[PDB]
Design a protein around this ligand. Structure first.
Ligand SMILES: CC(=O)NCCc1ccccc1
Length: 115
């Protein structure tokens, strides 16, 4: 409340640490379905079904241009990539498996880096 503040968690390194995590996901061998936006002209039903498309290159752009107010907004966009993947792809597909693998990879890096 007014003039009563919890101790301040140090967030000064967050931008650099998120960039590092993003780099590791970009270089994962299973990253290939997620490196660029899905082509909305060539993929049947993707535009109508997937309300908020997201991919690693778009995250990298937003991160580099100060469009994430904080580390949670960044994690939300990473998770959106894999939530979109699950919605549109069968679990028993190369891309479906890639999504599950990358989500697991991300959440471990997330925990170890910030929690
Ligand atoms: C990342 C992602 O979901 N890409 C599209 C999956 C896809 C499925 C079927 C045909 C073409 C494309």
């Amino acid at each position: 409340s007014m003039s009563v503040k919890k101790p301040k968690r140090d967030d000064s390194k967050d931008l650099a640490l998120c960039s590092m995590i993003l780099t590791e996901m970009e270089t994962h061998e299973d990253a290939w379905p997620f490196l660029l936006p899905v082509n909305l002209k060539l993929v049947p039903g993707y535009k109508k079904v997937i309300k908020k498309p997201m991919d690693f290159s778009t995250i990298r752009e937003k991160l580099s241009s100060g469009q994430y107010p904080n580390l949670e907004t960044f994690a939300l966009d990473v998770r959106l990539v894999f939530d979109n993947c699950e919605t549109f792809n069968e679990d028993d597909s190369d891309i479906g498996r890639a999504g599950h693998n990358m989500r697991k990879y991300f959440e471990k890096k997330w925990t170890d880096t910030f929690k």
